[PDB]
């Protein structure tokens, strides 16, 4: 329903006013929300756009990888006490049993955090270096923000109409994922429990077991 152009939906509904001039609806996820003038020149608008989409994809992965192991732990998969809650999952590799995938001894069973970090550093260094320059040994020229090709094996992005609607879906889902990831970060600090645990605690008695029940735990004391 007109996801681009001048008649795009905006970030305040009918009370949005005049959108900024630099936001013409050329790019996906344009709701006209720039109240601080960050995107005055299009170069930093491009840098902020690629940073936003990279953060969006990383947050989709993060939200899925935060929800899924805890749901599996509550549904039967043996995550003992720290592998379930994501903010203590990093402490799982320091036990004698180590980091086991799905609680299986034969799966992964990692104990060297140094080796894990070194492998992650070199692999992500190669991957982000290939992403940064736009050239890889196996692919020559693509859109540095929307590559496709080897990254699109099923080929859902062929015609511009569905490519644009799927781009809007991607950026909006990533924005929801970033919002939920910030929610996870604040919920872990404030409540000290997992996200699914906070949700189930909210479902028991939402009138009193909400965020306002934890508003008096950060009060300074003289």
């Amino acid at each position: 329903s007109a996801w681009y152009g001048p008649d795009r939906p905006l970030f305040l509904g009918s009370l949005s006013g005049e959108p900024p001039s630099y936001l013409t609806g050329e790019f996906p996820g344009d709701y006209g929300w720039d109240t601080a003038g960050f995107s005055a020149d299009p170069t930093t608008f491009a840098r902020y756009r690629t940073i936003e989409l990279i953060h969006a994809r990383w947050a989709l992965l993060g939200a899925l990888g935060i929800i899924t192991p805890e749901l599996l732990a509550k549904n039967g998969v043996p995550f003992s006490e720290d592998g379930a809650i994501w903010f203590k999952a990093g402490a799982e590799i320091f036990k004698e049993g180590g980091l086991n995938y799905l609680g299986n001894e034969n799966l992964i069973h990692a104990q060297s955090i140094l080796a894990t970090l070194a492998v992650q550093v070199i692999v992500m260094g190669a991957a982000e270096g290939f992403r940064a320059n736009g050239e890889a040994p196996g692919v020559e020229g693509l859109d540095p923000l929307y590559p496709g090709g080897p990254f699109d094996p099923l080929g859902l992005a062929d015609d511009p109409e569905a490519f644009a609607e799927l781009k809007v879906k991607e950026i909006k889902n990533g924005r929801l994922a970033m919002f939920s990831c910030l929610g996870f970060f604040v919920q872990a600090i404030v409540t000290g429990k997992g996200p699914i645990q906070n949700l189930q605690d909210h479902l028991a008695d939402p009138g009193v077991n909400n965020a306002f029940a934890s508003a008096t735990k950060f009060v300074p004391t003289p």
Partner: protein, 50 residues
């Protein structure tokens, strides 16, 4: 109906001790799990749906 059972004389409770009485409803069970477990219940014996 909710206001009638809460603040306007209550409703007749047959489960009140002694044989039932006109009771004022206090602390209605607003928990979604137990409320909708009636809805997703089987309609056979022992469950009876709603």
């Amino acid at each position: 109906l909710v206001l009638k059972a809460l603040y306007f004389g209550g409703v007749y409770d047959t489960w009140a001790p002694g044989g039932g009485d006109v009771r004022i409803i206090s602390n209605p069970t607003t928990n979604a799990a137990i409320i909708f477990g009636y809805i997703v219940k089987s309609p056979f014996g022992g469950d009876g749906w709603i």
